[PDB]
């Protein structure tokens, strides 16, 4: 009882790809077949279902992907169109045992990478502080970005606001308790004495490279 | 100096939507304009840019979205096609100061929700244990799934393997040190005495509802 997948590969965003899942060792025609995917380092996510015929799709792929089957070849297909980087994942086909509500046979998986630079690692992800505390947030770049590192403040329900650019230059009107430092790959934002209005999420952003990338944010929360 | 967005709303997967960003208080024709988006509860992500004419797109939207501008109306547009749930986000337009490498004017944001649903909360996300330890993993459903809860084991580079279905039934061949319990909304997987082959990631999955959602996984790691 086996499911053998094929068709994965590297594809440009906006492009198309068709996955195949060849079954053997069981009566393919009788069985409900699903696709489930797993982004790199992430969890399992249901994608699509087909049975003997009402087919179903998750909102992640509905309207772009088509599931189908050729019972004479004991094969399941996933036609993937208008691909995005967010579709990058290992795609598994699986047999669904509808009496159990569970998948009892899995393919080996096939990797689909949707791709045509600099990673920004912000730390900590969150911190709790009190009014009056000194706070320092760090942002590391995987490659030198020179001085082109900016810091933004974002309050709940509001747009980001530029505070610091070129690593250490303050935007007009930004209070002097904010300062920035660093060059190349290591950068710091410091708040000298936290005020109530400063509890917010802070983001760094590199502006040296054509695909501008943001740090993941630091939530400055109240003790 | 303002950016006023419009166009967001609720759209079906696979559908289209056009966002607008009306500029005032500054000379629009000279300025590089970008779109940056933020999924609910997540960080900022660059989407697309346009200047006076070479336009750029992130791999998340390249080949599906089109950025454009009408200088006579001082307006920036984002044409969104072939939409996915992963496009759900607040979309910001922003003026890019190319000398600073930073965004110095931001719109107020407009929300795009791409949608046509049990939530499974697994805990803990990870745990360290030693050979011989008793381990319990819990899975909670946002509403009753009855008994239709399954548990899978996944080792690095391998496909998931069914261990338990219908909350407490073991798949054939699964060792007796694995057991499951629970009904309705609270479920538990227990390993009575951990063996080296049991260090793996474990996933729960509800099979009561047509969306078949997975828990986020529990990584059982070695002390």
Nearest of A171, A168, A31, A33 to residue A92 by alpha carbon: A33
**Same-domain check for residues A89 and A181:** no
Q: Give the side-chain half-sphere CA count within 13 A for B52.
A: 4
SS3 for A173-209 is: CCCCCEEEEEECCEEEEEECCCCHHHCCEEEEEECCC
**Same-domain check for residues B123 and B221:** yes
| Cβ contact A103–B46 (<8 Å) | no
The Cα–Cα gap between A153 and A206 comes to 15
The Cα–Cα gap between B51 and B98 comes to 10
Is residue B223 within 8 A of residue B198, CB to CB? The reply is no
How does DSSP assign A104-123, residue by residue?
Answer: EEE---EEEEE-----EEEE
Q: Which residues of A touch B172 (CB under 8 A)?
A: none
Q: Does A8 touch chain B (CB under 8 A)?
A: no
* Burial readout B56-79 (b: 16 or more C-beta within 10 A, e: otherwise): bbbbbbbbbbbbebeeeebbbbbe
**Same-domain check for residues A88 and A177:** no
DSSP bridge pairs for A138: A123, A188
**Same-domain check for residues A124 and A200:** yes
The encoded tokens of residue A19 equal 């996955």
**Same-domain check for residues B55 and B7:** yes
For B103, name the nearest residue in chain A, comparing CA atoms only.
A162
Q: How far apart are the first and last CA of chain A?
A: 57
| CA distance, residue B170 to nearest chain A CA (Å) | 11
For A91, name the nearest residue in chain B, comparing CA atoms only.
B159
Is residue B131 within 8 A of residue B221, CB to CB? The reply is no
How does DSSP assign chain A, residue by residue?
Answer: -EEEEE--EEE-TT--EEEEEEEESS-GGGSEEEEEEE-TTS-EEEEEEE-----EE-TTTTTTEEEEEEGGGTEEEEEE-S--GGG-EEEEEEEEETTTTEEEEE---EEEEE-----EEEE-SEEEE-TT--EEEEEEESS--TT-EEEEEE-TTS--EEEEETTTEEPTT--TTEEEEEETTEEEEEESS--GGG-SEEEEEE-SSSS-EE---EEEEE-
The encoded tokens of residue B76 equal 């920036």
**Same-domain check for residues A135 and A186:** yes
Residue range(s) defining the domain that contains residue B79? 1-116
Burial class (CB in 10 A: 0-12, 13-18, 19+), B211: middle
The Cα–Cα gap between B223 and B130 comes to 6
The Cα–Cα gap between B174 and A133 comes to 54
**Same-domain check for residues A138 and A90:** no
Q: Which residues of B touch A60 (CB under 8 A)?
A: 13, 84-86
Q: Does B102 touch chain A (CB under 8 A)?
A: yes
CA angle in degrees (0–180, nearest 5) for B35-B36-B42: 160
| CA distance, residue B37 to nearest chain A CA (Å) | 11
Nearest of B136, B133, B18, B113 to residue B69 by alpha carbon: B18
**Neighbour count for residue A16 (Cβ, 10 Å):** 12
Radius of gyration of chain A (CA): 24
Domain boundary, last residue among B116, B139, B170? B116
Q: Does B97 touch chain A (CB under 8 A)?
A: yes
Q: Give the side-chain half-sphere CA count within 13 A for B145.
A: 34
How does DSSP assign chain B, residue by residue?
Answer: -EEEEE--EEE-TT--EEEEEEEESS-GGGSEEEEEEE-TTS-EEEEEEE-----EE-TTTTTTEEEEEEGGGTEEEEEE-S--GGG-EEEEEEEEETTTTEEEEE---EEEEE-----EEEE-SEEEE-TT--EEEEEEESS--TT-EEEEEE-TTS--EEEEETTTEEPTT--TTEEEEEETTEEEEEESS--GGG-SEEEEEE-SSTT-PBP--EEEEE-
Torsion angle defined by CA atoms of residues A61, A65, A71 and A76, in that order, rounded to the nearest 10 degrees? -60
Q: Does B44 touch chain A (CB under 8 A)?
A: yes
**Same-domain check for residues A95 and A121:** no
| CA distance, residue B27 to nearest chain A CA (Å) | 19
The Cα–Cα gap between B37 and A216 comes to 13
**Same-domain check for residues A61 and A102:** yes
The Cα–Cα gap between B153 and A206 comes to 39
| CA distance, residue B39 to nearest chain A CA (Å) | 12
Q: Does B219 touch chain A (CB under 8 A)?
A: no
The encoded tokens of residue A190 equal 């410091």
**Same-domain check for residues A123 and A67:** no
**Same-domain check for residues A98 and A127:** no
Q: How far apart are the first and last CA of chain B?
A: 57
For B4, name the nearest residue in chain A, comparing CA atoms only.
A159
The Cα–Cα gap between A84 and A127 comes to 34
CA angle in degrees (0–180, nearest 5) for A167-A169-A173: 135
Q: Does B1 touch chain A (CB under 8 A)?
A: no
Torsion angle defined by CA atoms of residues A180, A182, A183 and A186, in that order, rounded to the nearest 10 degrees? -120
**Same-domain check for residues A59 and A94:** yes
Domain boundary, last residue among A97, A116, A135? A116
| Least CB–CB distance from A100: residue in B116, B160, B166 | B166
Is residue A36 within 8 A of residue A115, CB to CB? The reply is no
DSSP bridge pairs for B188: B138, B181
| Cβ contact B86–A60 (<8 Å) | yes
| Cβ contact B206–A15 (<8 Å) | no
| Cβ contact B14–A64 (<8 Å) | yes
Q: How many domains does chain A have?
A: 2
Is residue B189 within 8 A of residue B204, CB to CB? The reply is yes
Q: Which residues of B touch A150 (CB under 8 A)?
A: 100-103
Domain boundary, last residue among A72, A97, A116? A116
CATH number at residue A43: 2.60.40.10
| Surface of B (136-175) touching A: CB under 8 A | 148-150, 152, 154, 159-162, 165-166, 169, 171
Peptide bond into A82 cis (omega under 30): no
Residues in chain B: 223
Q: Which residues of B touch A109 (CB under 8 A)?
A: 159
| Cβ contact B205–A103 (<8 Å) | yes
CA angle in degrees (0–180, nearest 5) for B99-B105-B107: 145
| Least CB–CB distance from B106: residue in A56, A160, A171 | A160
The Cα–Cα gap between A220 and A127 comes to 5
**Neighbour count for residue A7 (Cβ, 10 Å):** 16
């Amino acid at each position: 009882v086996q499911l053998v997948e094929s068709g994965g590969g590297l594809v440009q965003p906006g492009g198309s790809l068709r996955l195949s899942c060849a079954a053997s060792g069981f009566t393919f025609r009788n069985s409900a077949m699903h696709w489930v995917r797993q982004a790199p380092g992430k969890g399992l996510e249901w994608v699509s279902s087909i049975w003997y015929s009402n087919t179903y799709y998750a909102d992640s792929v509905k309207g772009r992907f088509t599931i189908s089957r050729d019972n004479s070849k004991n094969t399941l297909y996933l036609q993937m169109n208008s691909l995005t980087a967010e579709d990058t994942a290992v795609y598994y086909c699986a047999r669904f045992a509808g009496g159990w509500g569970a998948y009892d046979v899995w393919g080996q998986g096939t990797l689909v990478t949707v791709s045509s630079d600099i990673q920004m690692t912000q730390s900590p992800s969150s911190l709790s502080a009190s009014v009056g505390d000194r706070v320092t947030i760090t942002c590391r770049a995987s490659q030198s970005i020179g001085l082109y590192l900016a810091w933004y403040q974002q309050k709940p329900g509001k747009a980001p606001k530029l505070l610091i650019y070129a690593a250490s230059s303050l935007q007009s009107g930004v209070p002097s308790r904010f300062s920035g430092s660093g060059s190349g790959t290591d950068f710091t934002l410091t708040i000298s004495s936290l005020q109530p209005e400063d509890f917010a999420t802070y983001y760094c952003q590199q502006g040296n490279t054509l695909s501008y990338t943001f740090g993941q944010g630091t939530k400055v929360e109240i003790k």
